[PDB]
Ligand binder design. Structure first.
Ligand SMILES: [Fe+2]
Ligand SMILES: [Fe+2]
Ligand SMILES: [Fe+2]
Ligand SMILES: [Fe+2]
Ligand SMILES: [Fe+2]
Ligand SMILES: [Fe+2]
Ligand SMILES: [Fe+2]
Ligand SMILES: [Fe+2]
Ligand SMILES: [Fe+2]
Lengths: 162, 162, 161, 160, 162, 157
C-alpha cells in the first residue's frame, strides 16, 4: 500500500503551509497580546490551535501512506505593524492555500484516492470559513475607523464578576 | 546575625520608596474613584495592596538582621489632575526604583548575601511587570485619544460573581 | 458648596495623625510578633487595620467637599522596648487625638455642618474605647508584673497539630 | 527599557533551537505511536508539550524587552528508525542546548540582567532532568536488549 | 555529564552535617518528651522531618550529578540536660552549617553551576529561619525565667488524640 | 526503677543495628529508584520506614530504664552495584541481627525482664519475615534470570 509520489508531494506542501500558518498565527497572537488587545489575541490563538489540529490529521494520513514527512521546509513569514497588514497577509496565505487545495482535490479525485481527498475538502471548508471571517472583519474595520474599532477589542471594565 | 550597614541602609531606602509608592497609588485610586472612573481605581488599589505586601516582607527581612526600619521619612509624593501625568509620575518613580534596586542587588550580591538578593529579585520582577503595563497603557492612550479611551471605563462593569 | 478652610485643615491634620498612628501601630505589632508575643501582635494588627479604615473614610470625606489631601507630611513616630513604653506612647497619642477631635467637632458643629461632625463622634468613640483598653492593660501589668504577663501572652507556634 | 544586543540574540538563538526541539519531539512521537509503542508515545507527547510551554515563556520574555522574535529560521532536525539513534539525537541536542545555556547565563549575569537569568536557570534545570532520563533509559535499553524492551513497552489494548 | 569533585565534597559535607543534625534533634525530641514536655517535642519533630527532607534533596542532587553518596561519615553528636544547653548546641550547629554552606555557595557559583547553588540557597534560607527561632526562644527563656517558662509548655493529660 | 547493664548494652547494640539498617535500606532504595526499577524502590522505602518505627520503639524502651542510648556509633554499611550483592548484604545483616536477638532474648529472660522480651520477639518475627522475602526474591532471580527479572519490574510512567 504505497501512495503516488504526487500525492506525497501535495500532502507535504499542504503540511508546510499548515506549519507556516501555525507559526504566523502564534507570533501574531503574541503581538496583539503584547499590544494589550485581548479578544483578537484569544481568537487568533484558537485559530492557531485549529491549524495545529489540521496539521495533526494531515501528518497522520501521510504517515499511514508509508511516507516520510518533511519537517525542515518552511515558507516565508510576514509581519506588519497595524491590524490591516495582519488581516491582509492572513488573507493572502489563506487564498494561496485555497488555490492549492482546489488543485489537489481535483487531481486526487482524478487519480483514485479518496480519504486524502476527503481531508482535503475538510481543510478547504474550514479555510473558506476563516477567509469569510477575515474578509468581514476587514470590511468592518475599513468602514468603521481604525481607532474607533480598536476601542472595542480593548476593555478593562471588571469582566471578572458573572 | 547582624548585618553590615550597607544592606541595612539599602533596605531602609527601599522601605521609604515603597511607602511613597503606597501613598501615591492610594491617592491616585481615590481621586480616580471621585471622578467616576471605576476600573482604573480598582486596578490601582490592587497595585497598592501589592506594594503594601512588598513593604511588609522587606520590613520583616530587615528586622531579621537586628536593624532599625525607618517609617519617619518619606520621599516626594506628587499628584496629577489627568491620566497622562499620573501615568508619567508612576513611570518616573518606577524607573528610579528599578535603577536603585539593580545597583543595590549587584553590590550586595558582591558582599555575600543571597536571600535578601532573592527578595530584591522578586521586587524587581513585580516592578518590571508594573512598568510594562504602564508603558503599554500610555502608548494605547496616546494612540487612541484621551476622550474616546476614557469612554471605555466609566460604567458597564456589572460584577456579579453569582 | 465647598466648605470653609478651617474645616479642611482640621480634617487634613486629623488624616496625618491617623497615618502616623497606623505606621506606629504596625511597627509595634511587627516588633511584638518578632519577639514571640503573638496575641499582642494580633490585637495590634487589628487596631492598625481599624485605624486604616478611619484614614480611608476620613480622606473620602476630605475629597467629598472638593479638598486637596496631602500625604507628604507626618507627625513624630516613637518606638519603645518593653510593653510599658509602647502603651504609654499610645496613650499620649490617643489623648492628643481625643482633645483635638473634641475641639474640632465643636468648632465646626458651631458652623452649620453635620456630616464631618458625625464622622468625628464615630472616631472619638473608637479612640475612647482604645484608650480604655490600653489603660486597663497598663493597670493589669502594674498589678501583676512583667515576666508573668509575658508568660500569659507568649505561646509556642508549634504548627504541628 | 531596551535591552542589549547580546542578550536578545542569545534569547533568539535559544528560542530557535527550542522550536526545532519541539518539532523533532512531535515527529518522533508520531513515529513511535505508528508502530505501537504507546507508552513512549505518551512520554514524548508530554515532553513536546513541556517544550511548547517553555517556548511560550521564552517568547514572552523576549517580546518584553522591545525585541523582535523570529519564527522563520530553524536549525537542522534529525530522524531515526530505531530507539537508539533517536535517543542519541535527543541527548546531543540537549547537550548543545545546555552548553549554550551555561555560556549565556554567565554572560547575562555579567551584563546586569536578572529575570532572564532566572528563566534560563529554570530551563537549564528541566533540561538537566530530561537528559538524565534519556541517559538512564538508553543504559537500561542497552543492558536489557531491544526485543525484550519492545515487548515491555507494547500495549496492544486498542479498544477497537 | 560529570562533576568536579569540589561540588561533590561540599555536598557530602552538607549531607553528613544534615544526618548528624537529624540524629541530634531526634534524640533531643525523645528526651524532651520523656521530661513530659510536649509542644517542644512536636516542634522538634517537625524540624527533624524538615532536615530529613533536606537530606533527601541533597542525596538526590549528588546522585543526579554522577556522585557516590557516602553515609558512613558522621560528625560529633552532643547532648544536654537543661533547655539552655540544648538550644545553645543547636545554635552552634546551625552556625557551622551556615558558614560551610556560605563557603560552598560562593566557591561553586564561581565554577559555572547554579542548580545545586539554588538548592543551597533554599537550605540556607531554611537554616537562617531555624537559627532565628533558636535565638529568639533562647533570649525569651533567659529573660523570663526557666521554671516559669517550663510551666507554659507542660500539660497534664492522657496521650493527646491526634 | 533501674535496669541492669547487660540488657542496656543489648538494647544499645540493637539500636545501632537498626540505625545501620535504616542507612543501608534508604541508600539502596535511592540507588534502585535512580535506575528505573520502581517497585523494588517502593518496597525498599516501606522496609526502611518499618526499620525506623522499630528503632523508635527500641529508643522508647531503652530510655524507660533510666539509661542512655547510643547514636554516635554505627556499624559498617555495605553497598553494591547489582541486585544480587545488595540482596546478600541484606541477608547477612539480617542473619547477624537475628543471632544477636536470640542471644539477648535468652540472657535477658534469665535476668527476669519481661517487656523487653516481648519487644525483642516482635522485632525477631519482623526480621524473620524480611529474611523470608529476601531469600524468595533471591532464588526466584537465580532460577529465572537477571534480564527477565529486571524486565518484569520496570514501569517508565
Ligand atoms: Fe498550538
Ligand atoms: Fe488549514
Ligand atoms: Fe516595590
Ligand atoms: Fe488596606
Ligand atoms: Fe484615631
Ligand atoms: Fe529545549
Ligand atoms: Fe521519617
Ligand atoms: Fe538543612
Ligand atoms: Fe529491624
Amino acid at each position: 500500500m504505497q501512495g503516488d509520489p504526487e500525492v506525497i508531494e501535495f500532502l507535504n506542501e499542504q503540511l508546510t503551509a499548515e506549519l507556516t500558518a501555525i507559526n504566523q498565527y502564534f507570533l501574531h497572537a503574541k503581538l496583539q497580546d503584547h499590544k494589550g488587545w485581548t479578544k483578537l489575541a484569544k481568537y487568533t490563538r484558537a485559530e492557531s490551535f485549529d491549524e495545529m489540529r489540521h496539521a495533526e490529521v494531515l501528518t497522520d494520513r501521510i504517515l499511514l501512506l508509508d511516507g516520510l514527512p518533511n519537517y525542515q521546509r518552511l515558507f516565508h513569514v510576514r509581519v506588519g505593524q497595524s491590524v490591516t497588514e495582519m488581516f491582509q497577509a492572513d488573507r493572502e496565505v489563506e487564498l494561496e492555500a485555497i488555490d492549492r487545495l482546489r488543485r489537489g482535490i481535483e487531481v486526487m479525485r482524478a487519480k483514485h484516492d479518496i480519504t486524502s481527498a476527503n481531508v482535503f475538502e475538510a481543510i478547504l471548508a474550514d479555510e473558506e470559513h476563516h477567509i469569510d471571517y477575515l474578509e468581514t472583519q476587514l470590511d468592518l474595520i475599513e468602514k468603521l475607523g481604525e481607532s474607533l474599532y480598536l476601542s472595542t477589542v480593548i476593555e478593562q471594565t471588571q469582566p471578572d464578576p458573572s
